[PDB]
Amino acid sequence: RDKLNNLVLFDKATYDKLCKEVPNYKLITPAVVSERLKIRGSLARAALQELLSKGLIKLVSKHRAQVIYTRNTKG
Amino acid sequence: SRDTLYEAVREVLHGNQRKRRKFLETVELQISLKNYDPQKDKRFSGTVRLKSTPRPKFSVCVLGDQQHCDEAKAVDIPHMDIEALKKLNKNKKLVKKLAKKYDAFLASESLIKQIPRILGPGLNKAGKFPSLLTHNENMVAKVDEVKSTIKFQMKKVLCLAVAVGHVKMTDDELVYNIHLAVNFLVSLLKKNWQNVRALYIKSTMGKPQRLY
RNA sequence: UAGUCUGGCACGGUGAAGAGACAUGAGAGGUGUAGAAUAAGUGGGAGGCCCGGGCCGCCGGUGAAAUACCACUACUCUGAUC
RNA sequence: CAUCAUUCUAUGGUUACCCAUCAUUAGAGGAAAUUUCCAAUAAACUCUGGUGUAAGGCUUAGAGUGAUGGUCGAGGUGCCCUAUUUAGGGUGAGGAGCCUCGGUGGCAGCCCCACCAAAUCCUCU
Numbered sequence: 001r002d003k004l005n006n007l008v009l010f011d012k013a014t015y016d017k018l019c020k021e022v023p024n025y026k027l028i029t030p031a032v033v034s035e036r037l038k039i040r041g042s043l044a045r046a047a048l049q050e051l052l053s054k055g056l057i058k059l060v061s062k063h064r065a066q067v068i069y070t071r072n073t074k075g
Numbered sequence: 076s077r078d079t080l081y082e083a084v085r086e087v088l089h090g091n092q093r094k095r096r097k098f099l100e101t102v103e104l105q106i107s108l109k110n111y112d113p114q115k116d117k118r119f120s121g122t123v124r125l126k127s128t129p130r131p132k133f134s135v136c137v138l139g140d141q142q143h144c145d146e147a148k149a150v151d152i153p154h155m156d157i158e159a160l161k162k163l164n165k166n167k168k169l170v171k172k173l174a175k176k177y178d179a180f181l182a183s184e185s186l187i188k189q190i191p192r193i194l195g196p197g198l199n200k201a202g203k204f205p206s207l208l209t210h211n212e213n214m215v216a217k218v219d220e221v222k223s224t225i226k227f228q229m230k231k232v233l234c235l236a237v238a239v240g241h242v243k244m245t246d247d248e249l250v251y252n253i254h255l256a257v258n259f260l261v262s263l264l265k266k267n268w269q270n271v272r273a274l275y276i277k278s279t280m281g282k283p284q285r286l287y
Numbered sequence: 288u289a290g291u292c293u294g295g296c297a298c299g300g301u302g303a304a305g306a307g308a309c310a311u312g313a314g315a316g317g318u319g320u321a322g323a324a325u326a327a328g329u330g331g332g333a334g335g336c337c338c339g340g341g342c343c344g345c346c347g348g349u350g351a352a353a354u355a356c357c358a359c360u361a362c363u364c365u366g367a368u369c
Numbered sequence: 370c371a372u373c374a375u376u377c378u379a380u381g382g383u384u385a386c387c388c389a390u391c392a393u394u395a396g397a398g399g400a401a402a403u404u405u406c407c408a409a410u411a412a413a414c415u416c417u418g419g420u421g422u423a424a425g426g427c428u429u430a431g432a433g434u435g436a437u438g439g440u441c442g443a444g445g446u447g448c449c450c451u452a453u454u455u456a457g458g459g460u461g462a463g464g465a466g467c468c469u470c471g472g473u474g475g476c477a478g479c480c481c482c483a484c485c486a487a488a489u490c491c492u493c494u
Contacts, residue, residue: 014480017479017480021479021480022476024476025476026476027476028476032476032481035481035482036476036480036481036482037480037481038480038481071476096335096336096356096357097334097335098332098333098334098335098356099334100357101330101331103330103331103357103358104330105329105330105357105358105359105360106359107359107360108360108361109360113361114422116421118385120385121385122385133331164426165376167426168425168426169375171347171348171349171350172347173351182384188380191380191381191382191383192379192381192382193379193426195382195383195384196382196383196384196386196387196427197426198384199382199383199384199386199387199388199427200351200384200386200387200388200425201351202351202352203351204384204385204386205384206384206385225330226385227330228329228385230328230329231328231361231422231423232327232328232329232360232361232362233328233360233361233362234328234329234359234360234361235329235330235360236328236329236330236331236358236359237329237330238330238331275358275359277357277358278357279331279357280335280356280357280358281357282357283357283358283359
C-alpha cells in the first residue's frame with residue numbers, strides 16, 4: 001500500500017536529532033528509531049552500543065529480537 | 076419630462092430664514108426620478124452643460140507642457156513634473172494611502188501624448204475621470220472645465236445627485252443655474268421617456284421648495 | 288357549407304365579503320475580512336451644533352467610497368385605506 | 370531554465386472606459402465497464418475570440434530583486450449497504466474544485482503516530 005523509502009547512514013542534522021533527542025526518549029530500541037528517524041532497521045541495532053561505548057545509555061537486557069535501553073540516570 | 080413654471084421667476088432672495096451656517100456650502104440639487112433599470116443597456120449617462128459660472132471646488136490637479144508655463148500661474152497650478160507621476164500610482168497597493176490626494180487629472184496637446192504608460196491608464200480604473208480638453212486655443216483654458224460643464228453618472232441605486240451652483244454667487248446667480256440645467260432634460264431625451272416626475276429646487280442646507 | 292360545441296364583445300345591472308396590484312400616507316429594515324461600530328447609496332465633508340464655552344469626527348486604520356453636518360430614491364417585509 | 374510579484378527603463382494602449390473569474394453566444398475533445406474485439410454511442414469537465422458589471426497591476430520588449438539549477442510542501446476530502454448508526458460492511462473509471470504550517474493524545478514539541486472537519490460535486494456504468 002504506502003511504500004516508505006528509508007536511508008542507509010545518518011544525515012548530519014539527524015544525528016543531532018538522534019544523539020540529543022533519543023536520550024530524551026525512554027524506549028531506545030532499534031524498532032522505535034527506524035519508525036521515527038526512518039532508517040534501514042539493521043543500522044539502529046549497531047548505533048546504540050557505540051553510545052554505550054560513548055557512555056550515554058543503559059543496557060537493561062539485550063536479546064536477538066529486541067535490545068532495550070533507557071535515557072540517563074538521576075544521580 | 077417638460078413641466079416649467081417660468082412665469083414667476085423671483086422669490087429666490089429669501090436668504091436669512093434658510094441660511095444661518097458659516098462653512099463654504101455647495102448648492103447640490105437632488106431631483107426625483109422613477110421607472111429606470113440599472114441592470115440592462117438602459118443608460119442614464121452624459122454631461123449636462125453649464126456655461127454660467129458654476130465653479131466646482133474639490134481636490135483640483137492640472138498638468139500640461141504648453142505656453143501654460145505663465146498662463147496656468149494665474150490660478151497657481153500645482154504643476155508636478157511629467158517624470159514625477161511614478162509614486163502617484165506606486166504608493167497605492169504596496170502602501171495603504173491614496174497617493175493622489177487630488178480628484179482630477181488632465182489630457183493636453185502641443186504634444187499629442189499626455190502619458191500612455193503604466194501611469195496614465197493606471198488612472199483608467201481609479202475614478203475622477205481625466206477627460207478635459209486644453210489643446211490649441213489658449214484664452215485661459217485652465218478654469219474652462221470648472222467655469223464650463225458639470226458631470227453626473229448612473230449606478231445600481233436608481234437615484235441622481237449633482238451640484239448646479241455655489242454659495243459665493245448670489246440667488247440671482249443661483250437662478251442663472253436653474254433655467255440652463257433642466258431645459259437640457261427636454262433637449263436630451265431618448266425613449267427612457269418621462270424620466271422627471273418631481274423637481275426639488277434647494278439651497279445647500281435649508282428646506283424643500285417646488286418649481287415644476 | 289346548414290347545424291352543433293366553444294371563447295370574446297354587446298344588451299348587462301346591485302350589494303357585501305374577499306385575493307392581488309397600482310395611486311398612495313407613516314414606521315421598521317440592512318452583518319466581506321476588517322477599522323472602535325448590523326460599511327442600504329448617491330453631490331458631499333473637515334467642519335458645523337447646542338451649553339465665550341463644548342460636541343462628533345479628520346488623519347492613522349479596513350477598504351475607489353467612512354461616520355457630525357441638506358436630503359431623497361430604491362431595495363426585504365409589515366402597513367391606514369375618499 | 371519554465372514562472373506569478375518587486376524596483377530602474379519604457380516613441381509603447383483608449384477614459385463616459387480598460388483586467389482576472391463568474392453570467393451567457395458560435396467551436397475542439399472518452400477510460401473503465403464488457404466478456405472476445407472493432408468502429409460508434411452520449412457527454413461530465415477544459416479552453417479560443419463576443420459582451421457585461423460588485424475587488425484590482427491588464428497585456429508588452431527588457432536591465433537589478435522576493436523564492437526551487439527538482440519544486441511548493443502532499444496527506445485528507447466522495448458515492449453506495451447495514452437497527453454495530455459517536456459505528457460496521459464495500460473499491461469500477463476519468464475529469465474537476467478547496468484548507469493549513471491546523472487545535473487536543475503518546476518515548477509529551479520535532480520527528481513518529483491516532484483521531485474532528487473547513488467548500489466537494491458533476492458522469493458512462
